[model samples]
Target: SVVSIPINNAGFEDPFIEVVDDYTVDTPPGWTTYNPNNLVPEKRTTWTSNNGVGYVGPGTQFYNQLAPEGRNIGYIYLAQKPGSGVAGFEQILDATLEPDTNYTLKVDVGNLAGTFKGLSFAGFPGYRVELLAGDTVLAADHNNLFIKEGEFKTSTVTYTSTAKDLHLGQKLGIRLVNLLQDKFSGLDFDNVRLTAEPT
Candidate 1:
């Protein structure tokens, strides 16, 4: 059995939702934003410039509905400053995923930059994806299949685990992290779709 979920809602009430021209996910109620690395909201430099590139704002207001004029949000920025690790950056969900099934995760991303005087740069340094089973990491922080530096792009990664590796009937979700910390660059993500492949 395969179940598909779409995430691109303008508000945090809808799951498996899709938002056009926007990059922020509709965060569910009661789901708090977790930052394990203790990253400073302002100091974190990764941002999708608001100039048709994507949406970025001061503080985590991108998530807050009131502050920073409520920018809504699109792609999330992680590890804006160097020296931060997996310690102070994480978000938890109240649900778990089922085991013995192959899962496919998709994120719509593209042209992570603005036109330069008339030219455009299409390239992304890189980004990381992971799957955590409860507190244990089923899939550790790993880079995406393709390195889209500064262009519009979308990519998906698959994870297949046995029943032993995952709890048969449990809640599970995915999280994304930025790998490059040399410079503060932002990536745009939308339409986070997930589907079960097969047993």
Candidate 2:
């Protein structure tokens, strides 16, 4: 039998309140955001929860599309900074996996389909969706899947547990990372889902 893994706030529907005066670091409900290896300044780095109501970037009041299924989405801002890497968002699933199980994961990623300040210099860096068991990577898709303007791209990664003595009954973690290293770039995501079938 195939069992579905519930990813909390999968479509980023949870309400988020942003700090008006400061660049408040906000993650959609049931998720966390952090810079890779502490490479970027914490104060200057963050992933914004798209409210589907207004513009959320600098020098552009561009409104983004609604969540793939709801009214909210997830967004990452990777602007030119001192770091060589980018920030990322992650969610730990509640379902634990048994050894020798087959699992499938799917999510929608997209570019904001428009132009912002310094669009020529600020090219969109690619993004990655990874499935992990603790610190061990189970499966990943990272082919510089750059989201085109005005559309969404669905990405899927599958894994079959072969570990005979490890990672059994452990929670699954889903991570979305920004890999843009130059000027400012943004990535949007929504509709994340995962399923597993015991073998």
Candidate 3:
């Protein structure tokens, strides 16, 4: 049994507390966030809380249950134009692909929908998980799982490296994406995991 590859903030538990009402600032440790560089502040996005301190009780968003992995989860809340999108987070591992080894990736995705500040964040813009070698996505899970609001689902992506693989020696990486659709759309992720063994 081979150990899973190390992933920083895999469970999305960091900073211990979330910035209430401000989901754009304070990214989790060990990861990078990508968003509209040519846009305004409305394109706010980052990792946020499911129901942090003081947000206890029936009025809380995602109050139905705790976050799928830990208390904190990656959230992407953004206001965008009709032709825009966003990338949630990415961690470039120091690890590299090995010939004859099989790699498996698993991550939790969510369709976040609820009322915040008397405004509805209703509907899912969708999410994607990419397994990469250097920046090239070798394998991906493209919104394959269907989750309702307040629900969490795991998506899996698998790949095998061969002697002739294009990125055989390239470093391994993971990317989380949000396919924005609604003007006020949102998505979330947690518990990213990757493992490898001889195939």
TM-score of each: 0.57, 0.76, 0.83
CA lDDT, every model vs. true structure: 0.43, 0.65, 0.69
Off by over 4 Å in 1: 6-34, 42-73, 77-83, 86-95, 115-125, 147-150
Name the candidate that leads on lDDT: 3
Candidate 3 lDDT, tens digit per residue, 1-199? 6668999888777656554323325456787765433322422333221111121222347535566665567765555654475656778998998888989999988765577667765677777889999989999988888887777789999998877887888999998877665534667788899999887
Winner by lDDT between candidate 3 and candidate 2: 3
As for lDDT, the candidate ahead, 1 or 3, is 3
RMSD of 1: 8.6
Residue pair clashes in candidate 3:
none
> Lowest-scoring 10 consecutive residues by lDDT in candidate 1?
60-69
